[PDB]
Scaffold this motif. Structure first.
Motif, PDB file in Angstrom:
ATOM      1  N   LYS A  27     -35.902 -18.753  -7.816  1.00  0.00           N
ATOM      2  CA  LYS A  27     -36.151 -19.247  -9.164  1.00  0.00           C
ATOM      3  C   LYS A  27     -36.967 -20.527  -9.223  1.00  0.00           C
ATOM      4  O   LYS A  27     -37.715 -20.717 -10.184  1.00  0.00           O
ATOM      5  CB  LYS A  27     -34.821 -19.478  -9.893  1.00  0.00           C
ATOM      6  CG  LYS A  27     -34.156 -18.199 -10.378  1.00  0.00           C
ATOM      7  CD  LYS A  27     -34.936 -17.562 -11.514  1.00  0.00           C
ATOM      8  CE  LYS A  27     -34.139 -16.448 -12.175  1.00  0.00           C
ATOM      9  NZ  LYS A  27     -34.677 -16.102 -13.521  1.00  0.00           N
ATOM     10  N   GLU A  28     -36.849 -21.408  -8.234  1.00  0.00           N
ATOM     11  CA  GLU A  28     -37.516 -22.706  -8.270  1.00  0.00           C
ATOM     12  C   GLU A  28     -38.838 -22.618  -7.517  1.00  0.00           C
ATOM     13  O   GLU A  28     -38.860 -22.651  -6.282  1.00  0.00           O
ATOM     14  CB  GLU A  28     -36.621 -23.789  -7.673  1.00  0.00           C
ATOM     15  CG  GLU A  28     -35.529 -24.291  -8.606  1.00  0.00           C
ATOM     16  CD  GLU A  28     -34.197 -23.606  -8.370  1.00  0.00           C
ATOM     17  OE1 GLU A  28     -34.006 -23.033  -7.277  1.00  0.00           O
ATOM     18  OE2 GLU A  28     -33.337 -23.644  -9.276  1.00  0.00           O
ATOM     19  N   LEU A  29     -39.938 -22.507  -8.258  1.00  0.00           N
ATOM     20  CA  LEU A  29     -41.266 -22.580  -7.661  1.00  0.00           C
ATOM     21  C   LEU A  29     -41.510 -23.994  -7.153  1.00  0.00           C
ATOM     22  O   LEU A  29     -41.300 -24.967  -7.884  1.00  0.00           O
ATOM     23  CB  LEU A  29     -42.337 -22.186  -8.680  1.00  0.00           C
ATOM     24  CG  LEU A  29     -42.060 -20.995  -9.600  1.00  0.00           C
ATOM     25  CD1 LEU A  29     -43.289 -20.677 -10.432  1.00  0.00           C
ATOM     26  CD2 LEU A  29     -41.640 -19.777  -8.797  1.00  0.00           C
ATOM     27  N   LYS A  30     -41.957 -24.111  -5.907  1.00  0.00           N
ATOM     28  CA  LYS A  30     -42.074 -25.420  -5.281  1.00  0.00           C
ATOM     29  C   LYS A  30     -42.913 -25.308  -4.017  1.00  0.00           C
ATOM     30  O   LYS A  30     -43.293 -24.217  -3.588  1.00  0.00           O
ATOM     31  CB  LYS A  30     -40.692 -25.999  -4.964  1.00  0.00           C
ATOM     32  CG  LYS A  30     -39.977 -25.265  -3.843  1.00  0.00           C
ATOM     33  CD  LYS A  30     -38.858 -26.092  -3.236  1.00  0.00           C
ATOM     34  CE  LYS A  30     -37.950 -25.216  -2.384  1.00  0.00           C
ATOM     35  NZ  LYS A  30     -37.162 -26.016  -1.409  1.00  0.00           N
ATOM     36  N   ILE A  31     -43.197 -26.469  -3.426  1.00  0.00           N
ATOM     37  CA  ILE A  31     -43.843 -26.586  -2.129  1.00  0.00           C
ATOM     38  C   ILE A  31     -42.987 -27.536  -1.301  1.00  0.00           C
ATOM     39  O   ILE A  31     -42.194 -28.309  -1.836  1.00  0.00           O
ATOM     40  CB  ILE A  31     -45.299 -27.100  -2.248  1.00  0.00           C
ATOM     41  CG1 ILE A  31     -46.114 -26.189  -3.160  1.00  0.00           C
ATOM     42  CG2 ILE A  31     -45.995 -27.148  -0.899  1.00  0.00           C
ATOM     43  CD1 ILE A  31     -47.544 -26.641  -3.353  1.00  0.00           C
ATOM     44  N   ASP A  32     -43.150 -27.480   0.016  1.00  0.00           N
ATOM     45  CA  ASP A  32     -42.361 -28.319   0.908  1.00  0.00           C
ATOM     46  C   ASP A  32     -43.199 -28.657   2.132  1.00  0.00           C
ATOM     47  O   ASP A  32     -44.213 -28.013   2.416  1.00  0.00           O
ATOM     48  CB  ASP A  32     -41.057 -27.629   1.314  1.00  0.00           C
ATOM     49  CG  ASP A  32     -39.989 -27.718   0.244  1.00  0.00           C
ATOM     50  OD1 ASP A  32     -39.914 -28.756  -0.442  1.00  0.00           O
ATOM     51  OD2 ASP A  32     -39.220 -26.746   0.091  1.00  0.00           O
ATOM     52  N   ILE A  33     -42.751 -29.675   2.863  1.00  0.00           N
ATOM     53  CA  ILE A  33     -43.346 -30.092   4.127  1.00  0.00           C
ATOM     54  C   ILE A  33     -42.206 -30.571   5.012  1.00  0.00           C
ATOM     55  O   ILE A  33     -41.457 -31.478   4.633  1.00  0.00           O
ATOM     56  CB  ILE A  33     -44.396 -31.204   3.938  1.00  0.00           C
ATOM     57  CG1 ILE A  33     -45.550 -30.748   3.041  1.00  0.00           C
ATOM     58  CG2 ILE A  33     -44.916 -31.675   5.283  1.00  0.00           C
ATOM     59  CD1 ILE A  33     -46.427 -31.877   2.555  1.00  0.00           C
ATOM     60  N   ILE A  34     -42.056 -29.970   6.187  1.00  0.00           N
ATOM     61  CA  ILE A  34     -40.935 -30.305   7.063  1.00  0.00           C
ATOM     62  C   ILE A  34     -41.474 -30.614   8.455  1.00  0.00           C
ATOM     63  O   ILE A  34     -41.459 -29.744   9.338  1.00  0.00           O
ATOM     64  CB  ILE A  34     -39.883 -29.181   7.096  1.00  0.00           C
ATOM     65  CG1 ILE A  34     -39.269 -28.966   5.710  1.00  0.00           C
ATOM     66  CG2 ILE A  34     -38.748 -29.532   8.044  1.00  0.00           C
ATOM     67  CD1 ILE A  34     -40.004 -27.975   4.836  1.00  0.00           C
ATOM     68  N   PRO A  35     -41.995 -31.820   8.688  1.00  0.00           N
ATOM     69  CA  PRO A  35     -42.397 -32.206  10.048  1.00  0.00           C
ATOM     70  C   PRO A  35     -41.178 -32.301  10.951  1.00  0.00           C
ATOM     71  O   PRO A  35     -40.213 -33.003  10.642  1.00  0.00           O
ATOM     72  CB  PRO A  35     -43.060 -33.574   9.845  1.00  0.00           C
ATOM     73  CG  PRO A  35     -42.490 -34.080   8.565  1.00  0.00           C
ATOM     74  CD  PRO A  35     -42.312 -32.867   7.706  1.00  0.00           C
ATOM     75  N   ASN A  36     -41.225 -31.589  12.077  1.00  0.00           N
ATOM     76  CA  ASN A  36     -40.113 -31.521  13.023  1.00  0.00           C
ATOM     77  C   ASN A  36     -40.632 -31.954  14.387  1.00  0.00           C
ATOM     78  O   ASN A  36     -41.070 -31.114  15.189  1.00  0.00           O
ATOM     79  CB  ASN A  36     -39.520 -30.116  13.073  1.00  0.00           C
ATOM     80  CG  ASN A  36     -38.127 -30.093  13.664  1.00  0.00           C
ATOM     81  OD1 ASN A  36     -37.729 -31.005  14.388  1.00  0.00           O
ATOM     82  ND2 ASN A  36     -37.373 -29.044  13.357  1.00  0.00           N
TER      83      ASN A  36
END
Ligand SMILES: Nc1ncnc2c1ncn2[C@@H]1O[C@H](COP(=O)(O)OP(=O)(O)O)[C@@H](O)[C@H]1O
Ligand SMILES: Nc1ncnc2c1ncn2[C@@H]1O[C@H](COP(=O)(O)OP(=O)(O)O)[C@@H](O)[C@H]1O
Ligand code: BEF
Ligand code: BEF
Lengths: 623, 9, 111, 621, 111
Positions: A60-69
């Motif tokens: 339901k939640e349109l979004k973007i993300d960035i997860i530097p690991n």
């Protein structure tokens, strides 16, 4: 003879070495490319779900993300967009110069609330600029998950996936090279995102510990209709964009339609920043956004140099871009952007003019830019002059306009009078204006060095020409009685004129009689063709001027005489008694020098004047 | 004819 | 039996060479004090590329790694004496028709 | 489970649209692309004809040709190169990113001195920028004459042609568009060739009738120890279209990771456009493999070295795909440093020709004086390149290093006076005492000298000390200091009295040590603007009006303790505290000294009125 | 049945439209005073294209032309009234997804 027919092919081994080694020069826009692709995916799913609202059932939640690991040394970009199936994987990621975005946009209804970034088809392969083998995960609504592992080595291996469900959307996983590890920090990622993709329409969240520390909290208000925004939200947008701690002074919102279309915002700052006329390597004021993505900021063609203080944003929809998406093709287009920005900034000034409460605030900071544009800009020299405020004699402390001078001008004057000096007290008390102010005619004070450059290119105003009061012919609206008075004075004062000429050889061209003095004795004026008295003081201190032309167009000095002063009235009798008297030959030189000091001239070796004064002091002291 | 101010101090 | 293309650059403590041989099979990378040798069998044309590079200056071989990949074979050598700038790779001034300098990682480290 | 393995692809129509539309911004470089291909073929055949000289039996002249034809719109380009067989046609002209030039240049034997101007693989298809239907006739020495034709629509036909013979050499025949006929005029093609592709080693002949476009062979590719100055002059006249021979020349090369050659010319006469255009810095050009790339993009040459003209050549740089600009912008930070370090030595070997240095320094002094202000690293090298007038030099300018050699045994600083002309500063009241003791004063009259001195502050360990600043220290004798002490001990009443008279315009009234004949001068404070610096910083027309009130000169009056007028004035001052004559004479003396010191007097009408009033008493009116 | 992407630009006396269909067959280009129509049969897939454009302003078609090059179908329309600038090709303000402006030959003739 026979004709063989073939078909063009492509060397798919060098075609990627070109795309990686040569096309892209900045090893930082990979994040911009990935973010733009994620935005395309989100726009796709959002537009598709406008008909069947059940498409968001898996998420339901349109979004973007960035997860530097850093432990895995991978820069994951979680997403919740449309995704893409296996056939779409093989026909979109494995075919150089093929983009599904353009084919999708070409197949939608005529007119829709959607605009996508990217048409070339080579953007994704920029991710191997700063990364090892890439890994893409995906999940459409009509398929299962499919891991996609390639390394730009002539292969890309779609396979079946058994990992954690994503619901709906891609999950890119790069593999940064050993020396490029400096894009896993807070500072570098934040700087890159803010510089490039700050105005993306969907939230961006950087999961680094977990604290969802969003990077996109400002929104683009230039898209909304101007009538909807309050005069206070502009202030918040200005403060966020520029980091200023005070609201804007003026604001302009306009759009242009035709074969070239763009929107623009123009903010006039409150107080001019210091060091305004120094930075010649970077000005970066009028940014250029194409579909809400940064393109360029440093190009003089955008706005002339004399409008450096204006800071704003210009957004366009369908401009042509270089293959790197960093430079604008057809660099002849900018001649329309400049022409459309300048004539709108001038309307902004014109509308700011009718509020005479903050026009002082505007003028005290931005007068020099106007007075320089009058010198340089040869097309707006008409509309750029009515925005000038000048101190005049009949005003006192409040500045007045030229259109007010013309409104208060006498019914018999046929020109505008003006005088150029160093300060205001020096100018007001000067000897030249003693007769102009006595008759009642107003005078215009010009106490700024830039005023000489402003008035060289100004020749008239409202059909009335600007004549100075330190030049040869100052034609006062004189009554006919003073004509015969002048004839009597002239016919009564020849011998003294020739005697003064023969002592003042090679200094003054010709000694005449005056019509602009009431109390002060002789004053020195210059000639029409040539620099005025004050302009020499400027041009001899520019420090970057050729020395050959100084002696060519210098001046032609002309002494004058006030026929009422006792000092000259008795001097004429003394001359007629004996034309070769020594005291006369000293007094005339002393009077010439002390009149020369009155004007804005300078002598050569003033010690010869200091000694003249010291000797006659010693005469009075009895030594 | 060109204003040649040179940044000073 | 032909030489393979290459690109090279250096830093303060390491030397870098990138043999652009796609789809590398049977790679024989061999360092030495003053000589280098590369032997692959890659691509579809199925040649056996061989590179015979003479080294400019003494380097430590026991601290040198190569990271094979589907697009290249990146060699990372350990410089012998810290800070000694390399003006060229091979000993002889004569040009090598394939070896160039990779200008996308070139840096003025000795600023 | 299963891992399916595939291979990349490429959509041909989209790739063609990309190459045609969004690679090249200038539609005028198709001619340089085809000329580069022609020279590539010529170099190929010229190298081939070495080991087996029988290759030249089908023709022995190496050349290029161009034959515009306005009746039916074509633009021929005849060559005499290696040519192409059928396999070369099929596998070179039909593959987008395949280049036979790179493959040929990968098979050179050991070190053959041949340089080709193509690596990328695309650039033939730039002809379709202005051409409708390219036709390529060709004939190798192995396979017969074939005709090639394509409209760039995913199809191309390799015919078999029985037409007129060519012998050996390709022949491109474009078919220009309807609104692109402008490329058939002699003037247009001549200008395009001259700008872009002038320095190529093979003749170019436009049949309009054999006016070879390139008569000037390059000379930067030859060992500089083999060139006479006449050749340098004849190349300068062709390069810069100058009717006047050059003045100096440098020829240096750089070896290593970044290599380039360079020429540097210093014109005899300074152009009247310096510091004026500030739009294009086209003095220094950048060539790669003897082909125009780009003019000077700002950081190639610093502003203070704008007068240098020259050429830079290189064999390997990271060019863009459009071949119109470099890719990495870090190269133009080493090239700048190298060029500057070479120019600052060219000046040094120009210096030792004293009869020739004057002709240079008479026209190019402002550039050095600006470089001293701006080049924060090269001050110690731009300092010994200055020549100045001094009191003991007459009409012969001398350098600072010549001044230091004439220094007295007790001197501890360098003295300098600044004004607006030599005639004023020669006779000014400040040097009257320094000249008396036989000390050498340095004159500074140009306005740029104010910026030059403000940033030097030193030379050879000596520190520049002005004579208009308070605190001047002259070598004094034991008798002199005690005489000055007693003079100060007998002139305190008058000093404080006139200080009380003014109290606003000056902040002190001291006893002089630098005046001999002038009764009184005025010197500013040590922390502020000099007397002339203030007069200069009020004529810029673009400045900060506020800062003048915070960084301003602080005046400090002075008195000669021996001149008759002040000695007599002391009598009246001590006899009566408020005599009218005294309180008029002090103001008159202050204003007279204020005029002589170069200060911009404030409200000069009062000073004029005093003279006009006291002339009448002389006349008894 | 789908429209074919096009590009257009103008001059002082003619409106230029260039369609983008490679290797076209039996193209039926027909002009009208206020309408344009185009019905080709091209491409490798033997698909059918059709473009119906409502012209912004009246023109004389009797002096029009086209040139079926094997790369693009370059139309050329004769402007009815010389000097009349065109801000957009189609009557309706709504943007067409397949119509752009040929910025390579675009020229501000109104100067
Ligand atoms: N994260 C993603 N989610 C959905 N589709 C994606 C994603 N990344 C790439 N794509 C699709 O793959 C293609 C991107 O390939 P690319 O070479 O970058 O071309 P372009 O940038 O011109 O779209 C497009 O068809 C796009 O829709
Ligand atoms: N006039 C010519 N004579 C000989 N070879 C030619 C000629 N024109 C083109 N070629 C060949 O065609 C190819 C050039 O194609 P192109 O796409 O321009 O690539 P590149 O410019 O990188 O060499 C090379 O193999 C070159 O030898
Ligand atoms: F990154 Be792609 F051009 F949308
Ligand atoms: F035209 Be190619 F670059 F030789």
């Amino acid at each position: 003879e026979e004709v063989e027919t073939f078909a063009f092919q492509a060397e798919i081994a060098q075609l990627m070495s070109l795309i990686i080694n040569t096309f892209y020069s900045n090893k930082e826009i990979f994040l911009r490319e990935l973010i733009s692709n994620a935005s395309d995916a989100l726009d796709k799913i959002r537009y598709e779900s406008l008909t069947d609202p059940s498409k968001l059932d898996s998420g339901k939640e349109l979004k973007i993300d960035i997860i530097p690991n850093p432990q895995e040394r991978t820069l994951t970009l979680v997403d919740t967009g449309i995704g893409m199936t296996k056939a779409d994987l093989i026909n979109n990621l494995g075919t150089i110069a093929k983009s599904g975005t353009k084919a999708f946009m070409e197949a939608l209804q005529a007119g829709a609330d959607i605009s996508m970034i990217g048409q070339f088809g080579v953007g994704f392969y920029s991710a191997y600029l700063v990364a090892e083998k890439v890994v893409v995960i995906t999940k459409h609504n009509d398929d299962e998950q499919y891991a996609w592992e390639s390394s730009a080595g002539g292969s890309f291996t779609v396979r079946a996936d058994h990992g954690e469900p994503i619901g709906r959307g891609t999950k890119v996983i790069l593999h940064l090279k050993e020396d490029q590890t400096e894009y896993l920090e807070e500072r570098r990622v934040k700087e890159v995102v803010k510089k490039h993709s700050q105005f993306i329409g969907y939230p961006i969240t950087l999961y680094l510990e977990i604290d969802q520390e969003e990077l996109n909290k400002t929104k683009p208000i230039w898209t909304r209709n101007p009538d909807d925004i309050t005069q206070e939200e502009y202030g918040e947008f200005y403060k966020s964009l520029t980091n200023d701690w005070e609201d804007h002074l003026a604001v302009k919102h306009f759009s242009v339609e035709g074969q070239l279309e763009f929107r623009a915002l123009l903010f006039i700052p409150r107080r001019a920043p210091f060091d305004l006329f120094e930075n010649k390597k970077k000005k970066n004021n009028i940014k250029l956004y194409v579909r809400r993505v940064f393109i360029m900021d440093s190009c003089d063609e955008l706005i002339p140099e004399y409008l450096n203080f204006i800071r704003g944003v210009v957004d366009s929809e369908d401009l042509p871009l270089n293959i790197s998406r960093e430079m604008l093709q057809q660099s002849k287009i900018l001649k329309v952007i400049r022409k459309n920005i300048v004539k709108k900034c001038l309307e902004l000034f014109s509308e700011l003019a009718e509020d005479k409460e903050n026009y002082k605030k505007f003028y005290e900071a931005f007068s020099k830019n106007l007075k320089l544009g009058i010198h340089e800009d040869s097309t707006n020299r008409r509309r750029l002059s009515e925005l000038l405020r000048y101190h005049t004699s009949q005003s006192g402390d409040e500045m007045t306009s030229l259109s007010e001078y013309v409104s208060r001008m006498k019914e018999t004057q046929k020109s505008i009078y003006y005088i150029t000096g160093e300060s205001k007290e020096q100018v007001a008390n000067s000897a030249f204006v003693e007769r102009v102010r006595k008759r009642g005619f107003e005078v215009v004070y010009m106490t700024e060095p830039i005023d000489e450059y402003c008035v060289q290119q100004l020749k008239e105003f409202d059909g009335k020409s600007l004549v100075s009061v330190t030049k040869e012919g100052l034609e006062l609206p004189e009554d006919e009685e003073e004509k015969k008075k002048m004839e009597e004075s002239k016919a009564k004062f020849e011998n003294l004129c020739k005697l003064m000429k023969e002592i003042l050889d090679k200094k003054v061209e010709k000694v005449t009689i005056s019509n602009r003095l009431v109390s002060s004795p002789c004053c020195i004026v210059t000639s029409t063709y040539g620099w005025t008295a004050n302009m020499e003081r400027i041009m001899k201190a520019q420090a970057l001027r050729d020395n050959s032309t100084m002696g060519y167009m210098m001046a032609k000095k002309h002494l004058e005489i006030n026929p009422d002063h006792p000092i000259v009235e008795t001097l004429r009798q003394k001359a007629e008694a004996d034309k070769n008297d020594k005291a006369v030959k000293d007094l005339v030189v002393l009077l010439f020098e002390t009149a020369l000091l009155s004007s804005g001239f300078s002598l050569e070796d003033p010690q010869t004047h200091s000694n003249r004064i010291y000797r006659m002091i010693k005469l009075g002291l009895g030594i | 004819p060109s204003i040649l101010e040179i940044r000073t101090k | 039996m032909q030489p393979a293309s290459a690109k090279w650059y250096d830093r303060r403590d390491y030397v870098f060479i990138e043999f652009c041989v796609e789809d590398s099979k049977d790679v024989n990378v061999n360092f030495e004090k003053s000589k280098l040798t590369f032997s692959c069998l890659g691509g579809s044309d199925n040649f056996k590329h061989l590179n015979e590079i003479d080294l400019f200056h003494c380097i430590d071989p026991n601290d040198s790694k190569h990271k094979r990949t589907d697009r290249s074979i990146l060699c990372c050598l350990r410089k012998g004496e810290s800070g000694q700038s390399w003006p060229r790779l091979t000993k002889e001034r004569a040009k090598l028709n394939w070896l160039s300098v990779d200008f996308n990682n070139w840096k003025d480290w000795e600023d």
